Amino acid sequence: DDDKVKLYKTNKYGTLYKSESASFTANTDIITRLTGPFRSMPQSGVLRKGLTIKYDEVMKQDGHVWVGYNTNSGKRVYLPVRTWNESTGELGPLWGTIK
Protein backbone atom coordinates (compact mmCIF):
# COMPACT_ATOMS: atom_id res chain seq x y z
CA ASP A 1 0.00 0.00 0.00
CA ASP A 2 2.91 2.34 -0.74
CA ASP A 3 0.56 4.51 -2.79
CA LYS A 4 -1.15 5.34 0.50
CA VAL A 5 1.98 7.12 1.75
CA LYS A 6 3.82 8.12 -1.45
CA LEU A 7 2.66 9.89 -4.60
CA TYR A 8 2.61 7.68 -7.69
CA LYS A 9 1.93 8.67 -11.28
CA THR A 10 1.53 6.65 -14.47
CA ASN A 11 3.49 7.32 -17.66
CA LYS A 12 3.02 6.47 -21.34
CA TYR A 13 4.55 3.02 -20.80
CA GLY A 14 1.96 2.19 -18.16
CA THR A 15 4.70 2.36 -15.55
CA LEU A 16 3.75 3.45 -12.03
CA TYR A 17 6.44 5.76 -10.71
CA LYS A 18 7.33 7.95 -7.76
CA SER A 19 10.06 10.55 -7.27
CA GLU A 20 12.39 9.34 -4.50
CA SER A 21 16.07 10.06 -3.93
CA ALA A 22 17.75 7.52 -1.66
CA SER A 23 20.55 4.94 -1.66
CA PHE A 24 20.32 1.26 -2.58
CA THR A 25 23.02 -1.25 -1.64
CA ALA A 26 22.82 -4.56 -3.52
CA ASN A 27 23.23 -7.87 -1.70
CA THR A 28 23.62 -9.72 -5.00
CA ASP A 29 24.84 -9.18 -8.60
CA ILE A 30 21.91 -7.49 -10.37
CA ILE A 31 21.35 -7.18 -14.13
CA THR A 32 20.51 -3.61 -15.13
CA ARG A 33 18.58 -2.39 -18.18
CA LEU A 34 18.82 0.52 -20.60
CA THR A 35 16.02 2.86 -21.72
CA GLY A 36 13.32 1.58 -19.38
CA PRO A 37 12.18 -0.84 -16.62
CA PHE A 38 11.65 -3.88 -18.87
CA ARG A 39 13.73 -7.07 -18.89
CA SER A 40 13.20 -7.05 -22.66
CA MET A 41 15.34 -3.91 -22.94
CA PRO A 42 19.04 -4.20 -23.82
CA GLN A 43 21.23 -5.08 -20.84
CA SER A 44 23.11 -2.08 -19.46
CA GLY A 45 25.48 -3.96 -17.18
CA VAL A 46 25.57 -5.51 -13.73
CA LEU A 47 25.49 -3.80 -10.34
CA ARG A 48 27.89 -5.86 -8.23
CA LYS A 49 26.99 -7.16 -4.79
CA GLY A 50 27.95 -4.72 -2.05
CA LEU A 51 27.93 -1.60 -4.22
CA THR A 52 25.76 1.39 -3.36
CA ILE A 53 24.09 3.67 -5.89
CA LYS A 54 21.97 6.78 -5.45
CA TYR A 55 18.67 6.58 -7.30
CA ASP A 56 16.10 9.30 -7.95
CA GLU A 57 13.07 7.38 -9.15
CA VAL A 58 11.19 4.21 -8.17
CA MET A 59 9.02 2.32 -10.66
CA LYS A 60 6.64 -0.63 -10.83
CA GLN A 61 6.65 -2.36 -14.20
CA ASP A 62 7.28 -5.75 -15.79
CA GLY A 63 6.73 -7.75 -12.59
CA HIS A 64 9.29 -5.86 -10.51
CA VAL A 65 9.96 -2.68 -8.59
CA TRP A 66 12.87 -0.81 -10.18
CA VAL A 67 14.96 2.23 -9.29
CA GLY A 68 16.41 4.62 -11.83
CA TYR A 69 19.84 6.22 -11.59
CA ASN A 70 22.72 7.56 -13.67
CA THR A 71 26.21 6.06 -13.83
CA ASN A 72 29.48 8.02 -13.70
CA SER A 73 29.28 8.37 -17.49
CA GLY A 74 25.78 9.83 -17.32
CA LYS A 75 24.15 6.66 -18.64
CA ARG A 76 20.58 6.21 -17.39
CA VAL A 77 20.10 2.77 -15.82
CA TYR A 78 17.05 0.84 -14.63
CA LEU A 79 17.75 -1.51 -11.74
CA PRO A 80 15.26 -4.17 -10.59
CA VAL A 81 15.30 -4.48 -6.78
CA ARG A 82 12.47 -6.92 -5.95
CA THR A 83 9.56 -8.78 -7.54
CA TRP A 84 6.12 -7.20 -7.78
CA ASN A 85 3.02 -9.31 -8.34
CA GLU A 86 0.90 -7.04 -10.53
CA SER A 87 -2.07 -9.33 -9.82
CA THR A 88 -1.93 -8.89 -6.03
CA GLY A 89 0.53 -6.10 -5.33
CA GLU A 90 2.62 -8.61 -3.40
CA LEU A 91 6.27 -7.60 -3.16
CA GLY A 92 9.13 -10.06 -2.95
CA PRO A 93 12.18 -9.58 -0.66
CA LEU A 94 14.32 -6.52 -1.39
CA TRP A 95 17.57 -7.58 -3.07
CA GLY A 96 19.59 -5.28 -0.87
CA THR A 97 19.17 -2.38 1.54
CA ILE A 98 17.69 1.09 1.16
CA LYS A 99 18.82 4.09 3.21
Q: Spell out the domain ranges in the chain.
A: 1-99
Half-sphere exposure of 22 (CA within 13 A, CB side): 12
Residue 63 has phi, psi (to 5 degrees) of 65, 20
- CATH code of domain 1-99: 2.30.30.40
How buried is 20 (Cβ within 10 angstroms: 0-12 exposed, 13-18 middle, 19+ buried)?
middle
The pairing of beta strand 43-47 with beta strand 96-98: unpaired
CA angle 81, 87, 88 (to 5 degrees): 75
Half-sphere exposure of 36 (CA within 13 A, CB side): 13
Annotated resolution, angstroms:
1.8
